[PDB]
Amino acid sequence: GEGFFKHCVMEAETEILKMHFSRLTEGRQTYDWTSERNMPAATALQLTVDAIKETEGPFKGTTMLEYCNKMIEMLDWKEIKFKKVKTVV
Amino acid sequence: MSLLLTIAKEYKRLCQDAKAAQMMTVGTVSNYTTFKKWTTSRKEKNPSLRMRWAMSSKFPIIANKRMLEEAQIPKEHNNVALWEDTEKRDHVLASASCINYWNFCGPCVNNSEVIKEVYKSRFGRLERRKEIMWKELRFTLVDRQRRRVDTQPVEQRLRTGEIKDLQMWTLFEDEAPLASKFILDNYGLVKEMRSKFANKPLNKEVVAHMLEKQFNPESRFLPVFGAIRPERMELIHALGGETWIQEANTAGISNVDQRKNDIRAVCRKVCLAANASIMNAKSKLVEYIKSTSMRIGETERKLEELILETDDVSPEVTLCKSALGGQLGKTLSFGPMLLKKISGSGVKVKDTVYIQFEYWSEQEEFYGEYKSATALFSRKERSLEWITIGGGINEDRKRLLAMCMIFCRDGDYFKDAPATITMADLSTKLGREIPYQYVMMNWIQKSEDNLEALLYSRGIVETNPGKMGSSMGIDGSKRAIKSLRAVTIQSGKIDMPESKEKIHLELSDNLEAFDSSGRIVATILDLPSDKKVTFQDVSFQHPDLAVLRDEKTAITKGYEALIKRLGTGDNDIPSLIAKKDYLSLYNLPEVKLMAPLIRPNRKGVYSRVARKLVSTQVTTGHYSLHELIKVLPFTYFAPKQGMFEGRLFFSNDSFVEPGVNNNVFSWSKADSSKIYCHGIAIRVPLVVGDEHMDTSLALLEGFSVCENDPRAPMVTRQDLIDVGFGQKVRLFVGQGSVRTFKRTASQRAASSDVNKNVKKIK
Amino acid sequence: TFAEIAEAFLEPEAVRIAKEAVEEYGDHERKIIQIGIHFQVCCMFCDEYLSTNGSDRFVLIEGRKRGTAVSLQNELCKSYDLEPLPFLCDIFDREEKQFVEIGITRKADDSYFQSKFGKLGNSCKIFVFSYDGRLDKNCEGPMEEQKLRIFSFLATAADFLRKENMFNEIFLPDNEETIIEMKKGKTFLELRDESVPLPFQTYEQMKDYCEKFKGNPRELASKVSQMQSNIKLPIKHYEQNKFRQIRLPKGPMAPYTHKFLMEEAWMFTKISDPERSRAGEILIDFFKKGNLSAIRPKDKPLQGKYPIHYKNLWNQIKAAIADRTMVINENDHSEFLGGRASKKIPEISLTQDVITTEGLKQSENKLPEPRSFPRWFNAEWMWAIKDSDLTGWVPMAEYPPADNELEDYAEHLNKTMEGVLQGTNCAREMGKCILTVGALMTECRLFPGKIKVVPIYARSKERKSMQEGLPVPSEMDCLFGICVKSKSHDGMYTIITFEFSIREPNLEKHQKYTVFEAGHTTVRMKKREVPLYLYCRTTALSKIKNDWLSKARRCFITTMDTVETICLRESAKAEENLVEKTLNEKQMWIGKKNGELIAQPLREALRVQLVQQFYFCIYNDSQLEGFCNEQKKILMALEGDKKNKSSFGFNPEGLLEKIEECLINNPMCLFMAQRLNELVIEASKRGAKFFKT
Amino acid sequence: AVVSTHSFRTRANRTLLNTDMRAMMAEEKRYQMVCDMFKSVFESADINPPIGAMSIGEAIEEKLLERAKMKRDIGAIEDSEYEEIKDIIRDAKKARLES
Amino acid sequence: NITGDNSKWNECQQPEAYLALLAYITKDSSDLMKDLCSVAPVLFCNKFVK
Ligand SMILES: [Mg+2]
Ligand SMILES: [Mg+2]
């Protein structure tokens, strides 16, 4: 072809733009950085988002795009808040 | 009663917890789909081990307390503990053995019938196995490695989205979106399924999950051995593999397999209709499609929803789909042959040569599919570069060879000129010049010597040793004494490629689809079958096929006026029935249209008994809403005390008895539809027929959405039947959103409204 | 596939207008569906209705071409002489003779209406619809039927959008169509702008070189220079056909890695009760009432590493058995596990002891000592191959009902094969493995962190075909020895094996084992009591190993397939039932005796494959894994030479180096190595594309 | 292919709960009871992914009201009991608003 | 024919090269998703390993 890439990308764009970010929980184990441990993707994403919520207010993106936009927004954040467990005797 | 209460109290408790409260308020309901996904049940690292570990302990399993309390003793017969009060979840723990005990001694009766038709899928896949014979032998089999062929086939198979709609409607009403497209058109299956499954509230989730499978042919990529019928697929493993074989199988098949072929013939004729008139091919075929109604073995279904959503893609079927918005790519049709493209590309170029012609100059490698014969070809610069045949029967191999040579288009294509200019050249279809590939094609399809001619047009050589098995004879043998050039047979079949792709583009004015910006997939007219045989098939609207008499069109259209025009509002049948006033009904202007067609001799004597039945049914809970239509037209005339039986109503010498479905009037049982000879019509919105109990919630709808202003009382769906016409009311829809409606004129011109405007703009 | 989406819910031809409009009017692939609504929304509104005159009530302007839509909007200036509006509206009424324009918004209506109203004021009849049924309008609303049908369409469309979850994308220009850009955080932009490979630093320059790329044919010369620099090895098989035979390690002879002893192991018969045996944990308790109680070893042991400990423990077992099969020890347990803990030190306090080095602080790791090819292995294989007097060990289930065609075959083949392989000693060991490792696997759940006495047993029924009516074929279970559990470390369990034997121990292979002189046991036959030795050791069991070793039956299957295939492939040639014939006639090369290559029929050389698979189960070390997974290359090169396919291998020294590398101290691994040597040899002798030293 | 006469849940090990991982899981359980609650209200929730431009709580409230009215009008449940349910609903709406 | 197996397949490949290749593919498609393609590699061009 001559538009091989253009079209393949089209298909990609379509599927992704549709996608609800909850489907991101589907997959292998990934690194939760809140507790700095490995987790099943679902629980790790739960913490990630929950943290975003407690830092700056609940997430209303409902899409992979707005998720990604928030991701890039957090790099500029000077301060971030976590759900971290500290036991006291 | 407290079942609904304790839920409310729970909600109170949960919304008091601010943390849970805010997450419950913010956002759509769609969040549930995400929320559920934030819980895996448990760790899944070591499956078999975990289970072996699990059952090892005597009391691990989670179980249901309440029901067991109600029906049976919790204590044991051999004095080994079975029950405790110790717990977080409401479900209390118990031993494994108890389950076996209730199976043994539990008190229960009469569940047998309930079961099977829930899993008619599985149970049927059993039933089929009973009816077959057996035989045993061995061979070095050459199986057909890759066919994307339907397995586990079931009647009325459908797409995933639509089946989801069914799933919703049948399982429950309380939370279901009022989904139009599937329900209006495919109603009847809705009736059946909803009827058998809604009444006896059991296994609400499970049944749904298994119905999803019940209409889903698992079209996997599998190795077969010639038996390509979707029925032998289910149990291929027992039938064969590379060294196994079994016998006496073709016989027992579901009624689907032949029904699909019937639809192919349907599409054949429907396409011949558009072929007949070349004033337009686009605006006419679409009409023949949407008009035509199919009758499945147990259901009436539209032709549109069958075509758009059929699995098998035949040359005809391609054309049929092309009219609609149905993407079914990866398919290439040329005459009777089927092809797939696997390599390279090139542009369509024009080349006049002495016998204008379209030739392709691509180094393209494609796959050849013909009856009982498969092959691989590659063309470069309008001539076949590489060729290999994996066919079974010699003849079919030769056919392959030929057809593919045609598509190939060498210089020898031009050399052979017996006739053509006389007949094949110009096609007698409003003076339309038929395309040239298809011309020589038809020339070869004509006679036996025409095959021999171009078969000889290829270079012939005495093949070398080492090509003894590979070489192809003119007659189609493997002798290799004399053989064709640029061709070698393969001892065995040839694999078929597959691509998960969807492509669609409009069609040209001569039944040509230049899909994917070219590619000539449409093949014009595949097969010139001039035959007109049909069984239990409906057609409509100046079909150009004469099945419509003058007297029968008078009767039928006369009925259609009444049936069709009545439903919208006041002074139409529904409102009249609700008022219990049957006079206005008699005096209806659409009945007057029907008056003059009745037999004059007994006109009053008929009207007598007619006016009787209609009046007797006026009391509610006794009227048959079908019968009323059948009886009404005769009532118009003044009722004379005939005292002579009026069972046979001569409407221009043809009778219409009460009940007793006949030629003129078919009173179908258990679903809303009625046949008038070779034609069918039905009205959906106001049928409360006594028999339509299960879908008196579904069927009553002719409503639509307006505005949300009136604080219309939140009525339940069952309460919707009572609110009369022109009444704006409020209702809960689907899984959250609440909207408002009134008794409406149904949605109209879904397609045409746009289509005509689009035609006007040009 | 936006067309796929639009055409699925919208009207087929209605989409075509969107697709065309998107090429010129704007340029966004997704937005088709957005306008796909609006467009259709209009047509339904304006078609069914006609004026009192012959002409239609409304005329559509939106769907048309732009430049044409202008001049057609100028027609209204001629017809009705109203102010020529700058903004091109959608539809023109003729009964009302006024401008009509339709808007559709997801959110609360006011939000968008105030926008469009700001654009055109009262100059046009502006009608704005929400999908939900929210309504906002100019002064007069459309006729009562068209309202109903349009809202009905919009609501259903909405539900299809929610099912595909496309929402924020759909919003109208002023609201969200503008903000379709990817968010650009300075952090990110910087990271990107120094993530680039090329001499170019700014991303933009990298972008340009990419987008404006057209490669010339200089990669031919780039490839030839790459080739000259490559000096890539063009290798031939005839040249390296030697493969330096196969390298093998030199040192102490490898030991008995299997958790249990096979060949030398000794049995103790007991005729089982269905209700007594059922416990399986009481088996030994009922055994002890027999002769077992008598046996006691001397303090002075042959070839023993920790005599007194093992002797004491034996006494602790024997004593336990009388009362209950548990070892009542809190402290002896800890040592016995140890035969140890390492007390830990905080880094924080450690800094001073680095400054003041004490306790001799250092760091080292250790490696395993290489061993040499075993001799005993051959004898073990030869013993496992032959049939035992006891009939069957592995509990196999019943057979299913049969139809003539296929089932008769399967059922027959299975009954025959099971018949052969159940009699073998290999099967014996499979049995004891399964039953005992099963017993432990239960004991880990039953009493964790506890010390328990578990038997080493296997179940068998004896079969008698003397053709006489005997009392019965003998139904029983026999014992190999006693075993001790110790839970430690979740992780690997520590286990202590005690096996009876009648054979004199060999220091070379039983190095891990600690032997005693136990006593004398009676052995007899008729058509003599030999001294009894007690073998003791300790070993490590991973829960994983417990699992995979428990399910030893699996080995049967991998044999089966391997066997069966041969019979079909053969028979499939002659298209005849040659299974029965092939099993008995087809000859498989099994061994060498007196320097002569031997072969046995497939039915008895079946035992070989079975044993081979059983060993694969037992002797599985990461070593073995690597061995086979590199050995395959050897085998493929071999058959390459067989059918004269003129093979080649690029760096055989490297291959043989990896093969060597994975050969450490694994009896099986090495055994197979040496046997592959002999293969290479005899093969070289048949047809020469190999070496012999 | 799934057959239905025996279907049961395997109890999770007492390992993840003892560690601090449970102190984290205190959030996940708050998701659970909600999901369980909504599913008790809407039957097809798991089967059909719930849709519509509504909050979860709002749909829950209105649906509860519909089921209450249904059971009252024709079914066997008292009127003062229906009003008691209405009271619980509105009282729940207060706590919902405050957040 | 040759049976080809590769060693250290991942170690050799570089996200730096993937960034460029992704920029080549997304050259024409869209400037709204091109920027969403280029982001994935740069997080591996600047990656930290525990
Ligand atoms: Mg406009
Ligand atoms: Mg507009």
Three-class SS of B90-155 = CCCECCCHHHHHHHHHCCCCCCHHHHHHHHHHHHHHHHHHHCCCCCCEECCCCCEEEEECCCCCCC
CA distance C438 to chain B (A): 10
Asked whether the beta carbons of C555 and B122 are under 8 A apart, the reply is no
Amino acid occupying residue B640: K
Query: Which one of E19, E22, E34, E36 would you mutate to disrupt binding with C, by most C Cβ within 10 Å of its Cβ?
Result: E19
User: Where a domain ends, among B476, B492, B508?
Assistant: B492
Together in a domain, B605 and B640 = yes
Mark out chain A residues that contact chain B at CB-CB < 8 A.
1, 20-22, 25, 40, 42-43, 46, 58, 60, 62
B613 with B669, same domain? yes
CA atoms lying within 13 Å on the CB side of residue C671: 20
- Residue pair B365/B388 in contact by the 8 Å Cβ criterion: no
Contacts 24+ apart (CB under 8 A), D5-10: D6/B99, D8/B61, D8/B62, D8/B63, D9/B41, D9/B62, D10/B41, D10/B42, D10/B50, D10/B51, D10/B54, D10/B60, D10/B61, D10/B62
Distances (CA, A) of C610 to B745, C85, C385, C624: 78, 92, 9, 17
Structurally, chain B folds into a number of domains equal to 6
Q: Which residues of A touch B27 (CB under 8 A)?
A: 58, 60, 62
Residue type, C144: E
Residue B261 in tokens: 């072929």
- The verdict on residue B196 lying in a domain is yes
- CB contact (8 A) between residue D28 and residue A43: yes
Question: How many Å lie between the centroid of ligand 2 and the Cα of residue C89?
Answer: 6
Is residue C28 a known part of a binding site?
no
User: Is residue C677 helix, strand or coil?
Assistant: helix
DSSP-based three-state secondary structure for D24: helix
Residues B648 and B722 in one domain: no
Helical spans, DSSP H, in C423-532: 425-446
C169 marked among binding-site residues: no
Contact D27 A43 (CB under 8 A): no
Parse chain C into domains and list their residue ranges: 1-170, 267-339+425-550, 374-422+554-686
Asked if C152 and B704 count as a contact pair (C-beta separation under 8 A), the reply is yes
Q: Indicate yes or no: CB of A17 within 8 angstroms of CB of C182.
A: no
Q: Do chains B and C touch (3 or more CB pairs under 8 A)?
A: yes
Question: B674 and B649 in one domain?
Answer: yes
With an 8 Å Cβ cutoff, are B34 and A20 in contact? yes
Confirm whether residue C38 is marked as ligand binding: yes
Question: Are B566 and B644 within one domain?
Answer: yes
C419's tokens: 């018949």
Interface test with D, best of C159, C162, C171 (most D CBs within 10 A): C162
Residues B602 and B671 in one domain: yes
Q: Which residues have a Cβ under 8 Å from the Cβ of B83 and sit 6 or more positions away?
A: B74, B75, B92, B94, B98
Q: Touching B: which chains, 3+ CB pairs < 8 A? A: A, C, D
Rounded to a whole number, what is the distance in Å from the CA of E38 to chain C's nearest CA? 8
* Same-domain status, B364 and B462: yes
On whether the CB atoms of residues B379 and B364 are closer than 8 A, the answer is yes
Instruction: Point out the domain boundary residue: B281, B312, B330.
Output: B330
Ligand 1 mean position, distance from CA B181 (Å): 28
Interface with chain C: mutation pick from A17, A19, A21, highest number of C CBs within 10 Å: A17
Q: Tell whether B660 is covered by a domain.
A: yes
The Å distance, Cα C42 to ligand 2 centre, comes to 9
In angstroms, the separation between the Cα of residue E12 and the nearest Cα of chain A is 23
Closest residue in A to E32 (Cα) is A13
User: Is residue C159 less than 8 Å (CB to CB) from chain D?
Assistant: yes
Instruction: Give the residue numbers spanning the domain of B179.
Output: 158-217
Q: Same structural domain for residues B483 and B345?
A: yes
Determine how β-strand C99-105 pairs with β-strand C91-93: antiparallel
Q: Which of B536, B554, B648 is nearest to B266 (CA)?
A: B536
Q: C400 to chain D, minimum CA–CA distance in Å? A: 21
Amino acid (one-letter) located at C98: Q
Residue B223 φ then ψ, to 5°: -95, 120
A46 near D CB under 8 A: yes
Tell me how many degrees the CA angle B622-B627-B633 measures, rounded to the nearest 5: 125
> What burial class does residue A50 get, using C-beta atoms within 10 Å of its C-beta: 0-12 exposed, 13-18 middle, 19+ buried?
buried
Q: Say yes or no: B562 and B683 in one domain.
A: yes
CB contact B175 to C (< 8 Å): no
β-sheet bridge partners, residue B483: B461
Label residues C76-105 b or e (16+ Cβ within 10 Å = b): beeeeeeeebeeebbbbbbeeebbbbbbbb
B115 and chain D in contact, CB less than 8 A: no
Whether residue B162 lies inside any domain: the answer is yes
The torsion region of residue C575 among left (phi > 0), alpha (psi -120 to 50) and beta comes to: left
Is B370 part of any domain? yes
**Is the domain of B340 the same as that of B484?**
yes
In chain C, what residues touch D51 (CB-CB under 8 Å)? 159, 162-163
Residue C223's CB is within 10 A of a number of other CB atoms, namely 11
Which ligand does the CA of C88 lie closest to?
1
**Dihedral over alpha carbons A16, A22, A28, A32 (to 10 degrees):** 120
The 10 Å Cβ neighbour count of residue C412 is 13
CA distance B290 to B303: 7
Cα E39 from Cα B582, distance rounded (Å): 74
C603 contact partners, CB below 8 Å, separation of at least 6: C420, C583, C584
Closest residue in chain C to residue B746, using alpha carbons only: C149
Q: Does A9 touch chain E (CB under 8 A)?
A: yes
* Ranges assigned E (strand) in C117-156: 125-130, 135-137
Q: CB count, 10 Å around CB of C527? A: 2
Distance C102 CA to ligand 2 centre (A): 5
The interaxial angle of helices C2-9 and C32-46, nearest 10 deg, is 20
Query: β-strands C529-541, B358-360: how paired?
Result: unpaired
Residue showing tokens 């003058």: B550
- Kindly write down the DSSP assignment for every residue of chain E, as one continuous string: ------SSHHHH--HHHHHHHHHHHTTTT-TTTHHHHHHHHHHHHT----
C-alpha to C-alpha distance for C389 and C405, rounded to whole angstroms: 35
**CA separation for the pair B614, C144 (Å, rounded):** 34
Which chains pack against D, by 3+ Cβ pairs within 8 A?
A: A, B, C
DSSP state of C452: E
Q: Could you tell me the two tokens for B154?
A: 């079931």
Residue C127's DSSP bridge partners are C102, C137
Task: Please say whether the beta carbons of C452 and C370 come within 8 A.
Answer: no
Q: How many CB atoms lie within 10 A of CB C492?
A: 15
Say if CB C258 and CB C618 are below 8 A apart: yes
What separation in Å is there between the alpha carbon of C63 and the centre of ligand 1?
Answer: 8
Contact check, Cβ <8 Å, D52/C163:
no
Residue B164 Cα, gap to closest chain A Cα (Å): 19
Query: For residue B713, is it within any domain?
Result: yes
Note whether residue B365 is domain-resident. yes
Annotate B521-536 with b (16+ C-beta within 10 A) or e (fewer): bbbbbbeeeeeeeeee
Of B229, B252, B275, the one marking the end of a domain is: B252
CB pairs under 8 A between A and C: 43
Chain A contacts of C166, Cβ < 8 Å? 17-18
Return the SS3 of B540.
Answer: coil
Of B716, B724, B717, B712, residue with least CA distance to B699: B717
What tokens were used for B39?
Answer: 């819980």
Tell me which of C188, C195, C206, C655 to substitute to probe the interface with E (most E C-beta atoms closer than 10 Å).
C195
The full length of chain E comes to 50
* Contact yes or no for A46 and D28 at CB 8 A: yes
Residue C194 known to bind ligand: no
Beta strands in C555-653 (DSSP E): 587-593, 596-601
Write the CB contacts of C50 (distance below 8 Å, at least 6 apart in sequence). C56, C57
Helix (H, G, I), strand (E, B) or coil at C588: strand
Whether B564 and B679 share a structural domain: yes
Are chains B and E touching, using the cut-off of 8 Å on CB pairs and a minimum of 3 such pairs?
no
C101 CA distance to ligand 2 middle (Å): 6
Cα–Cα distance, B103 to B107 (Å, whole number): 9
Query: Exposed, middle or buried, C132 (CB in 10 Å: 0-12/13-18/19+)?
Result: buried
| In a shared domain, residues B414 and B432 | yes
- Reduced to 3 states (helix: H, G, I; strand: E, B; else coil), residue C683 is helix
Q: C12 C-alpha vs ligand 2 centroid, how far in Å? A: 21
Q: Is B622 left (phi over 0), alpha (psi -120 to 50) or beta?
A: alpha
CA distance C213 to chain A (A): 14
Binding residue per annotation — C62? yes
Residues of B in contact with D30 (CB under 8 A): 17, 19-20, 23
- Cα D82 from Cα D86, distance rounded (Å): 6
In angstroms, the separation between the Cα of residue C683 and the nearest Cα of chain B is: 29
- Say whether E39 and A72 touch across the interface (CB within 8 A): yes
Chain-chain contact of C183 with A68 (C-beta, under 8 angstroms): yes
Data resolution in angstroms: 3.9
Strand residues in B499-599 grouped as ranges (E): none
Minimal Cα–Cα distance from C347 to chain E, Å? Answer: 20
